């Protein structure tokens, strides 16, 4: 069953409106009206601001084409507006006419919210109900007729592949449109070409309430109407107030940050850090006037980079035992941090009672608790604008949310927690006043206030685009730069330029963006396709779990942290670890080989080797989550068998170390540097940025032997001069198979080959030949495999792909 097919089948079933279920949904409607369990739900969804508004938002649908809807979180958008539809067609008779498909931000909004609605309709969810989810490679569908359908906004993208038109829906709704996410803005625009197409479609966008009329004016100026709430007064805390009610003292307990662990600075962020602390004395002065001198002692100390989960540790104590009932619900950056504090509360004995409720974002989150019961809920930033829990009355705002940036002058891309929004920071506050008055405690302090950035910027402003350039190509959706655009907020043409050289350097592109079989395979791996290109390598080589632990880091972080005043004895363990292999990737490999055999012999014995190594496990564990969805990700793609990074039949060759290194050369290339020889400092040459120094915190910083010229590198940062940050000594035959351009020069001397033309090295002409053979029988490999993937077998020994995987192997161990 063919790849353009996998979950094509609700769209691909006809729209044709039977009048006899036109007058069995009719006769349900009422036979519902009769169930217990339907009035009972039906009484909850009364008392929602969005039911008080319900004939008048079908009646807006009804008769226009494109509408917004605007609306505080809680008011019931995702899960009325969909149920209004179908209800309404439904009672005129015309309920089979009417195929809803809303789309979601995320998976487990899609299967959740489908869940609920079903809930709300006396129904199971799926199995032929009205309500039903699709997912990537995951369905409860629900009727083909009379039917609510949600899924997620690369189902859509996969559909237009199949049917451009969408010929099928009757009602498509965005959710959660101000999330502003890549592939939504992506839709949106395709949607609005489609209009002119489609004269029957409807198009709903739903939209929290903050700029909501940019998405009406982006379609025209279409019609918008917003479902009315009420908010109760809630009292702000900054972190001053926070520190003086609750007396804080940091505790009887610090590795390093910033250029050491890898994290370049923003200069648009440095400008308002300049105003920051110029700003800062006089701010200083006045809070003595106002505050405690331990609180303002206190508060000059905090760490800005950080959310103090100890301070909020602290707070929530306060709260449970100060004030008055009500469910608390903390905002924090990543699952890193929800499950320290989780494990902050509950390592008290005081927590561990019958009274208190603390989840971290499940069964009961949304269900109220006794009187005595205290509800703590531990959430990220996603629970912002998406998820409500009517019971909340305290909020803690840890200040911090994670995102992505892209320095387009030096082209590196890196993740942070970076400073919530003056718009995020109102939204928190708003969900303490949903049910009565309430408590925002904000963890930043009032000259932080008053310098936060008015509104998050969108991800097509900040993201690295070459995932989005293959998107906008497998879609056939024209040039990638003139789409782009078109975006309702088209991003700079230096990232665009930037992107597709990229793409064209990891060869996903061709001279004239176009699409190449890798790069088809690419833009079904969910990931940035640099990562995409190793992981796939790493399957097709059978080299698969060093792989996913390399990509794994890459993506995520390396898991060495260096404590404060120990630099010469991290330093010493991490070359330890490094083995003769001039790899700082192959030395997280080892340290993990090592940690997942430490846990193994006793987890003392794990807390033992973390520790005389400075690796945290915090790191280690998130890093063998990712590695299983990677796998996953492949398994969808049909490039593995299993959803296991440690496959045996993936993994024949996941010893070899040279096989490794060509692996991680496909997925950091054009990312090279030449070693200059040596006879002082260890320096190389760049391409363009000259000649550059290495880190301090790689194993190779004064590594003077090194076995072969050329290493490949991720990060490159700027600070007095250029640092490599970690580096992998390779062969010239990785660079000559995955590189650019292959040019022989022949003189008197020497038959040289040259990798886009600056990578030059000494190389009979009959190698340079057999490489161009190999990426050209490598390219119908992979075209072959457009249709249907399926995982090479490496068992099949006279397998053409076994042969011609086993040339290049051959090749690049040379
Ligand atoms: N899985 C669930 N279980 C119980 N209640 C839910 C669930 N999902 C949402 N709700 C409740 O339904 C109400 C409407 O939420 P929703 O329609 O998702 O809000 P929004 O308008 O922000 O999209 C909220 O008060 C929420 O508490
Ligand atoms: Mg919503």
Redesign the pocket.
């Known amino acids: 069953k063919s790849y353009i097919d996998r979950d094509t089948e609700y769209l691909l079933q006809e729209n044709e409106p039977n009048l006899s279920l036109d007058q069995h949904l009719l006769e349900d409607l009422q036979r519902k009206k009769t169930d217990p369990r339907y009035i009972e739900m039906q009484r909850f969804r009364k008392k929602?601001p969005?039911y008080g508004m319900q004939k008048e938002l079908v009646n807006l649908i009804n008769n226009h084409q494109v509408t917004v809807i605007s609306?505080e979180?809680?008011?019931?958008?995702?899960?009325?507006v969909t149920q209004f539809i179908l209800d309404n067609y439904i009672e005129r008779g015309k309920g089979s006419a009417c195929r809803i498909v809303c789309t979601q931000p995320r998976r487990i909004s899609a299967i959740?919210?489908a869940?609920?609605v079903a809930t709300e309709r006396a129904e199971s969810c799926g199995n032929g109900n009205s309500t039903g989810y699709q997912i990537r490679l995951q369905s409860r569908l629900p009727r083909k007729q009379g039917s609510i359908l949600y899924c997620t906004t690369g189902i859509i993208l996969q559909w237009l592949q199949s049917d451009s038109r969408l010929s099928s829906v009757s009602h498509i709704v965005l959710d959660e449109i101000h999330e502003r996410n890549l592939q939504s803005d992506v839709l949106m625009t395709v949607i609005k070409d489609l209009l002119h197409f489609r004269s029957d479609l409807k198009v709903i966008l739903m939209s929290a309430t903050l700029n909501a009329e940019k998405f009406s004016e982006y379609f025209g100026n279409c019609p918008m109407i917003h479902i009315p709430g009420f908010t109760f007064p809630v009292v702000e805390y900054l972190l001053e107030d926070i520190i003086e009610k609750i007396r804080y003292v940091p505790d009887q307990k610090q590795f390093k940050r910033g250029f050491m662990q890898g994290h370049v600075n923003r200069q648009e962020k440095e400008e308002k850090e300049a105003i920051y602390k110029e700003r800062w004395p006089a701010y200083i002065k006045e809070l003595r006037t106002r505050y405690s001198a331990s609180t303002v002692d206190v508060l000059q100390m905090m760490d800005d980079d950080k959310v103090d989960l100890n301070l909020i540790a602290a707070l929530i104590r306060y709260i449970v035992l100060e004030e008055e009932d009500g469910a608390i619900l903390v905002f924090l950056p990543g699952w890193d941090n929800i499950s320290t504090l989780h494990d902050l509360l509950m390592s008290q004995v005081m927590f561990k009672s019958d009274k208190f409720l603390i989840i971290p974002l499940q069964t009961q989150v949304?269900k109220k608790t006794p009187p005595g019961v205290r509800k703590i809920v531990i959430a990220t930033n996603i629970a912002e604008?998406?998820i409500?829990?009517?019971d909340v009355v305290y909020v803690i705002d840890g200040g911090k949310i994670k995102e992505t940036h892209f320095d387009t002058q030096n082209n590196i891309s890196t993740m942070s927690a970076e400073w919530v929004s003056k718009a995020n920071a109102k939204q928190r506050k708003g969900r303490a006043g949903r049910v009565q008055p309430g408590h925002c405690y904000h963890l930043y302090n009032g000259l932080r206030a008053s310098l936060l950035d008015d509104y998050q910027l969108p991800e097509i402003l900040r993201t690295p685009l070459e995932e989005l350039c293959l998107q906008i190509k497998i879609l056939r959706l024209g040039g990638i730069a003139y789409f782009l655009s078109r975006l309702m907020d088209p991003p700079s043409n230096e990232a665009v330029v930037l992107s597709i050289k990229h793409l064209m350097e990891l060869s996903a592109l061709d001279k004239q963006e176009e699409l190449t079989p890798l790069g088809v395979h690419l833009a079904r791996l969910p990931v940035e396709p640099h990562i995409g290109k190793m992981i796939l390598f790493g399957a097709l080589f059978c080299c698969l779990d060093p792989v996913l632990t390399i990509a794994a880091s890459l993506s995520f972080k390396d898991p060495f942290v260096i404590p404060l005043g120990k630099e010469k004895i991290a330093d010493a363990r991490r070359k330890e670890l490094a083995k003769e292999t001039r790899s700082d990737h192959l030395t997280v490999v080892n340290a993990f080989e090592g940690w997942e055999e430490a846990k193994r012999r006793g987890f003392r014995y794990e807390k033992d080797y973390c520790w005389e190594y400075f690796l945290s496990s915090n790191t280690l564990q998130m890093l063998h989550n990712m590695k299983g969805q990677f796998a996953e990700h492949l398994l969808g793609a049909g490039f593995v068998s299993s959803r296991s990074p440690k496959d045996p039949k993936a993994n024949i060759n996941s010893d070899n170390e040279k096989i490794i290194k060509a692996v991680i050369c496909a997925g950091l290339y054009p990312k090279v540097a030449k070693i200059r020889l040596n006879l002082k400092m260890v320096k190389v040459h760049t391409k363009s940025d000259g000649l550059v120094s290495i880190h301090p915190k790689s194993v190779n910083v004064e590594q003077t032997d090194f076995h072969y010229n050329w290493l490949i590198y991720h990060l490159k940062m700027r600070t007095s001069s250029i640092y490599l940050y970690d580096c992998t000594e390779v062969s010239p035959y990785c660079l000559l198979f995955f590189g650019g351009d292959i040019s022989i020069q022949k003189d008197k001397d020497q038959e040289i080959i040259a990798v886009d033309e600056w990578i030059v090295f000494q190389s009979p002409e009959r190698i340079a030949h057999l490489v161009k053979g190999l990426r050209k029988e490598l390219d119908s490999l992979l075209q072959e495999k457009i249709e249907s993937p399926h995982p090479v077998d490496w068992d099949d020994t006279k397998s053409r792909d076994c042969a011609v995987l086993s040339a290049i192997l051959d090749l690049i161990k040379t």
């Not at 979180?73 to 009325?80: F, I, R």
């Open positions: 929602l969005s609306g979180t809680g008011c019931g958008k995702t899960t009325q959740s919210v869940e609920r949304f604008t998406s409500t829990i009517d």
